[PDB]
Amino acid sequence: FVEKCSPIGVYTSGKGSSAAGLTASVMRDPSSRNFIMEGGAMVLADGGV
DNA sequence: AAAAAAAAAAAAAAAAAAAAAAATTTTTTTTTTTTTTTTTTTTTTTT
């Protein structure tokens, strides 16, 4: 309910969700050399719950 | 001195050579980017 009720809200387990992380992870693309930041629950639910 | 004939001048039309003009997208390559994979190496877990 809290996840559905908060303006910004994400519900996740301790070990993250199915193909989603609990916290952000930064990687470097070998080809484009960009910094790809996979957003976990903590970063995705920024300013919310 | 004038008229008739001859010849020349001017002008216009036609032809030949030579310089000018017009027309003129498709096919193949290949580089970069992205993904895939094989091995090495590093980290984590277990005893």
Swiss-Prot record:
Belongs to the MCM family. It comes from the Eukaryota. Early fractionation of eukaryotic MCM proteins yielded a variety of dimeric, trimeric and tetrameric complexes with unclear biological significance. The MCM2-7 hexamer is the proposed physiological active complex. It is linked to Meier-Gorlin syndrome 8: A form of Meier-Gorlin syndrome, a syndrome characterized by bilateral microtia, aplasia/hypoplasia of the patellae, and severe intrauterine and postnatal growth retardation with short stature and poor weight gain. Additional clinical findings include anomalies of cranial sutures, microcephaly, apparently low-set and simple ears, microstomia, full lips, highly arched or cleft palate, micrognathia, genitourinary tract anomalies, and various skeletal anomalies. Component of the MCM2-7 complex. The complex forms a toroidal hexameric ring with the proposed subunit order MCM2-MCM6-MCM4-MCM7-MCM3-MCM5. Component of the CMG helicase complex, a hexameric ring of related MCM2-7 subunits stabilized by CDC45 and the tetrameric GINS complex. Interacts with ANKRD17. Interacts with MCMBP. Interacts with TONSL; the interaction is direct. The chain holds residues 393 to 441 of 734 of the full protein. The modification N6-acetyllysine is found at K4. It comes from Homo sapiens. It is found in: Nucleus; Chromosome. Signal peptide: none annotated. This is DNA replication licensing factor MCM5. Acts as a component of the MCM2-7 complex (MCM complex) which is the replicative helicase essential for 'once per cell cycle' DNA replication initiation and elongation in eukaryotic cells. Core component of CDC45-MCM-GINS (CMG) helicase, the molecular machine that unwinds template DNA during replication, and around which the replisome is built.
